[PDB]
Amino acid sequence: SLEAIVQNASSDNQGIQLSAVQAARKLLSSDRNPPIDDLIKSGILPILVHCLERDDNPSLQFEAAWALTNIASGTSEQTQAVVQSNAVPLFLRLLHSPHQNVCEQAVWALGNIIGDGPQCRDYVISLGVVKPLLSFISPSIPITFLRNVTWVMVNLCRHKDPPPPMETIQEILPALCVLIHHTDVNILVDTVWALSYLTDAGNEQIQMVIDSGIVPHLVPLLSHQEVKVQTAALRAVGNIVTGTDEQTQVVLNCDALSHFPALLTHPKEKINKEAVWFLSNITAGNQQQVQAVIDANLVPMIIHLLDKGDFGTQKEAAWAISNLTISGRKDQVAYLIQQNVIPPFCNLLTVKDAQVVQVVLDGLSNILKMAEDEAETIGNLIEECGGLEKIEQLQNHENEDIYKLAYEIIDQ
Amino acid sequence: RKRAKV
């Protein structure tokens, strides 16, 4: 039956040939367990590729392109099989086809190819996929097609090692600046995941995202209705504030901190964790940045989470409270103890996580030194807590850095 | 990252 399909796919009779290619396509398209290996093994790929040249029969270009889309959606080995067959140049040709359904199906097939990894990505780029792919972005295009275009845009941004060439990023960013203004959720989500990926690849890429003009349009989406956009926006903006004080100030000057009360009280544990993670990277900043977090009424809300959050959120809140005791002035830390930090800040000394107890201690070590006169006054708030007796254990910890600190604090 | 059309 497969043997018949392949013979027939090369037929000089148009009906016989179209029915065969459509039958090859329906094997690949009609369950979620398609026989890709058998199709490849049967000699179909060259005929499907050759059908891509048949500008005279666009029904056949479409059906061949759909078959190849689904073969190239499998294992890297199956994707390699398509690419090995000289399919990419012919897909790129079909991006200039007058039949929309043929353009879209070519865009889809190149998405599966770009999605295989960075060599296939950099090959499709090197042949000029990005101009023609972005030029489909227009209001006139149907939504289902534009979603397939934004999904390919995510696939171009997806790999860090190596990331796409600087010049490709420079072509894609202007398209994301347009797409970030859309209302369709799947498109907004795809656009913000592209930005997550582009800002997850170190300070040069981050500067390109800033230079693009897009940050004032990204930060408002921290307050979008759909959690799925919020999760992506918070990631992308969190990636940017792992850069310089100056790169951070760009996010702060977009009024980012206005959106945090909703994130620090969000019902999803993960949105809380990433919000405190983000704020941990603002309090590791200069004293104006530390002050901005104070002025936005966020320190009390970071403490609630220090106390009553999942282990994950607490860890992040430890850091945000700790990072502050380092970067800040003695008035800024004064504000802290006035906000009942020491209780929920000492209740974490007894966790199996070395790094958390380590950063909790430093914070108490650093807070007492910078609270000069009122050093005793702090101790009587550590008694009531009953974290004095959890400091003892530390002194028995395997890890040197922790026990020293315990003794080093005992003295004073 | 890859999507079959079905």
Author numbering:
A (entry chain A): 72 to 483
B (entry chain B): 113 to 118
From the paper:
We recently showed that LSD1 phosphorylation at serine 111 (LSD1p) is critical for epithelial-to-mesenchymal transition (EMT) and is entirely nuclear. nLSD1p co-exists with CoREST as a repressive complex, and CoREST is known to stabilize nLSD1p to demethylate LSD1's enzymatic targets H3K9 and H3K4 (44). LSD1 is highly expressed in many aggressive cancer types including esophageal, squamous cell, hepatocellular, prostate, and basal-like breast cancers.
LSD1 H3K4 demethylation was only detected in the nuclear extracts of MDA-MB-231 cells and not in the cytoplasmic extracts, confirming that H3K4 LSD1 activity is exclusively nuclear and that nuclear localization is essential for LSD1 demethylase activity in TNBC. EPI-111 displayed high binding affinity for importin α subunits (interaction at nanomolar concentrations to prevent nuclear translocation of LSD1). In summary, FAD domain inhibitors such as GSK or ORYZON are unable to disrupt the nuclear LSD1p:CoREST complex in metastatic TNBC cell lines or disrupt the LSD1p and importin interaction. This indicates that importin-acting inhibitors and inhibitors that target the CoREST:LSD1 nuclear complex are superior to FAD domain only or dual acting inhibitors in reducing nLSD1p. Excluding LSD1 from the nucleus with the LSD1-S-A(111) mutant prevented EOMES pull-down in the half-way ChIP, and, similarly, when EOMES was hypermethylated, there was a significantly reduced interaction with LSD1 within the nucleus and consequently no EOMES pull-down. Second, that any LSD1-targeting therapeutic intervention must disrupt the nuclear LSD1p axis or the LSD1-EOMES nuclear complex, and it appears that phenelzine or EPI-111 will be effective in this regard.
